Every structure is written in structure tokens, then in C-alpha cells.
Paper text:
Receptor tyrosine kinase (RTK) signaling fulfills fundamental functions in development, tissue homeostasis, and metabolism of metazoan organisms. The FGFR subfamily of tyrosine kinases has emerged as an excellent model system to elucidate the molecular basis underlying allosteric regulation of RTKs in a physiologically relevant and unbiased fashion. These hydrophobic networks, located strategically at the interface between the N- and C-lobes of the kinase, sense the structural fluctuations in the A-loop and molecular brake and undergo rearrangements to determine the kinase interlobe angle and hence kinase activation.
To provide direct structural evidence for the participation of the αC tether in the allosteric communication network within FGFRK, we determined the crystal structure of the [name] FGFR2K mutant. According to our model, the [name] mutation should drive the kinase toward the active conformation by fortifying the hydrophobic contacts at the αC tether. Consistent with our prediction, [name] crystallized in a fully activated conformation displaying a disengaged molecular brake and an activated A-loop conformation. Additional structural analysis showed that the mutated V650 residue makes strong hydrophobic contacts with M537 and M540 between the αC helix and the A-loop thereby facilitating the rotation of the αC helix toward the C-lobe. Relative to the unphosphorylated WT FGFR2K, the D650A, D650L, [name], D650I, and M537I mutants were 3- to 19-fold more active, whereas the D650G, M537A, and M540A mutants were less active.
Numbering used by the authors: 468 to 580, 593 to 764
């Protein structure tokens, strides 16, 4: 792999610790990184390290490299998982990122329905607000995430919501992102119809996904289109089906979901608008 000195971190300053989880393209381990935070240059920082599994494919390696490169481009923001460094030379590829001790949002919510704590309604609105802020920022950086979902949000020790899993994200210009393929690699239940049927993707497709994410949040980690298999959703979406209102959701926030699910992308809210609406709702709690 080519060197990128501004991101490279010395392997001898990294100490791997316990596994945090694994997927079908990589694994993540906790680690201590001495000197990685130049605001505290003497200190060890607890980080997460993404790396290949022993059964990794060639495509897994190219994907991990591509994920690292995307994270170099998306800037820095409180409500996204930020890249901290990488070990790319003379050894296995290590992609070093911010550590979120409370795991992904889907499990965090399902575990707070013995529960860890109780989610107040204010907590859920705040969580929604933070993620709209993250997506607003990503869209300002001309990034479409394409895989927004509760499983791809991470939660820090201080309950900070961080958008993560940039492996499918793309940088676009002004017009729709378009590449025609045989079959897509995006979770169908979170995809905007124009993405599913027309292979086109804009920031407004991410807005659709955000509406699904809202539904996951206010169902405390429920599964979208409950009891509807992916196989049958193609037809139901084309015919205009939409999810019902979660129990713990206000009619105001449900109207917000349904706006995100507008059939016409240009008629959905923008993330800037969602942040403004969510700012108002959250201050009134
Ligand atoms: N920065 C992190 N801090 C703490 N835990 C993490 C971090 N990143 C990932 N994990 C966890 O370790 C596991 C690794 O999975 P991950 O690398 O996130 O891909 P994925 O989200 O499982 N696949 P997908 O949702 O289909 O895109 C997940 O269970 C995460 O919850």
C-alpha cells in the first residue's frame, strides 16, 4: 500500500487489546495508542482498530483501504466516528478510529427497553438530533453515506452518537450518483426507492434512510417493515407502502418520518431543515 505520512502511526506505539466485534469484511479490536492525540502527546488513548480477519479476501483488503481513504476525506465532526491514524506499512493494515465504548445504536437501544437505563423521550429526540447534525455535516462535505442505519451508529461512553461504517459512502458532485450494476450491496429495508429501482443516489436518498433510522430509534431498535420479508418489499414500496407510527413517537415526529419518505426526493426535507426542526422540538422538552 502507498504511504501517507500525515496519517501513519508507529506500530510500536499501538497495543492491541480485547476484540470488540467482527463482520464479514473485517474485525475490530480495542487498543492503546501512545501519543496519537497531539493535544495530549504523552498520553495513551484508548482506540478501536479495524483490521482484516484471518479468512480475509482480496476484496476485503481493497474495501478496508477504500474505507480508510473515505474517512480521510469527510472532515472531522463530533457526531461521526473520526479516523485517528493508520498502520499501512510493514505489517497488517490497521485503521485506527475513535473508540465508542457503548457499542452500536441498535444494540444500545434494545438494551435499554435487565435494561441498562430507561430512554426518556428527550433522550430519543436528542439522539435523533445528533444524527441529523452528523448527516448535515456529511452532506456539506459532499458525502453520501448510503448505509445509514442504527447498526451503523456508535455510542460513546458519554452517550455521543457517531455515524460510522463509511465502507459504502461516496463523494459526489452536484448531480445524482449513478452506476448501474447487476445487484446492489445496500440493505434493502433502508434504501430510498430511486436507489432501489433506479440505481441513483443523492443526499435526499440518505434523508430517506434517516427516516428509517428515526423509526428504529423510536421503536428502541425495532426491525423495519416488521413481518415483511425483503423479498416482498420491492413490490410494496413501488405501490406506496409506508411504515406505521411507532408507539413512543409523537405525531409531529411521525410526520417528519413520512416527509423523509416522500416519493419525490426533492420534496423530502434536507438535513439542514431536519436539524432546525429537531432543534426546536428538543428545546421544547
Ligand atoms: N469505533 C468502535 N468502537 C467500539 N466498537 C466498535 C467500533 N467500530 C465497530 N465496533 C464494533 O465491532 C463490530 C464491528 O463491526 P463493524 O466493523 O462496525 O461492521 P458492521 O457494522 O458490523 N457491518 P455492517 O453494519 O453490515 O456495515 C461491531 O459490532 C461494532 O459494534
Amino acid at each position: 500500500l502507498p504511504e501517507d505520512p500525515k496519517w501513519e502511526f508507529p506500530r510500536d506505539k499501538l497495543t492491541l487489546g480485547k476484540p470488540l466485534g467482527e463482520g464479514a469484511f473485517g474485525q475490530v479490536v480495542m487498543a492503546e495508542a501512545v501519543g496519537i492525540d497531539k493535544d495530549k502527546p504523552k498520553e495513551a488513548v484508548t482506540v478501536a482498530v479495524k483490521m482484516l480477519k484471518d479468512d480475509a479476501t482480496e476484496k476485503d483488503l481493497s474495501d478496508l483501504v477504500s474505507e480508510m481513504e473515505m474517512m480521510k476525506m469527510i472532515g472531522k465532526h463530533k457526531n461521526i466516528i473520526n479516523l485517528l491514524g493508520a498502520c499501512t506499512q510493514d505489517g497488517p493494515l490497521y485503521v485506527i478510529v475513535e473508540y465508542a465504548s457503548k457499542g452500536n445504536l441498535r444494540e444500545y437501544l434494545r438494551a435499554r427497553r435487565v435494561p441498562e437505563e430507561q430512554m426518556t423521550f428527550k433522550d430519543l429526540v436528542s439522539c435523533t438530533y445528533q444524527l441529523a447534525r452528523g448527516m448535515e455535516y456529511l452532506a456539506s462535505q459532499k458525502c453520501i453515506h448510503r448505509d445509514l442505519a442504527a447498526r451503523n451508529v456508535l455510542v460513546t461512553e458519554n452517550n455521543v452518537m457517531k455515524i460510522a461504517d463509511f465502507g459504502l459512502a461516496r463523494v459526489i458532485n452536484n448531480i445524482d450518483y449513478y452506476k448501474k450494476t447487476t445487484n446492489g450491496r445496500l440493505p434493502v429495508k433502508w434504501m430510498a426507492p430511486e436507489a432501489l429501482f433506479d440505481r441513483v443516489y443523492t443526499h435526499q436518498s440518505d434523508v430517506w434512510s434517516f427516516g428509517v433510522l428515526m423509526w428504529e430509534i423510536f421503536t428502541l431498535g425495532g426491525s423495519p417493515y416488521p413481518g415483511i420479508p425483503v423479498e416482498e418489499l420491492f413490490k410494496l414500496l413501488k405501490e406506496g407502502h409506508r411504515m406505521d407510527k411507532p408507539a413512543n413517537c409523537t405525531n409531529e415526529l411521525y410526520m417528519m418520518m413520512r416527509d423523509c419518505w416522500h416519493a419525490v426526493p426533492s420534496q423530502r426535507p434536507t438535513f439542514k431543515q431536519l436539524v432546525e426542526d429537531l432543534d426546536r422540538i428538543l428545546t421544547l422538552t
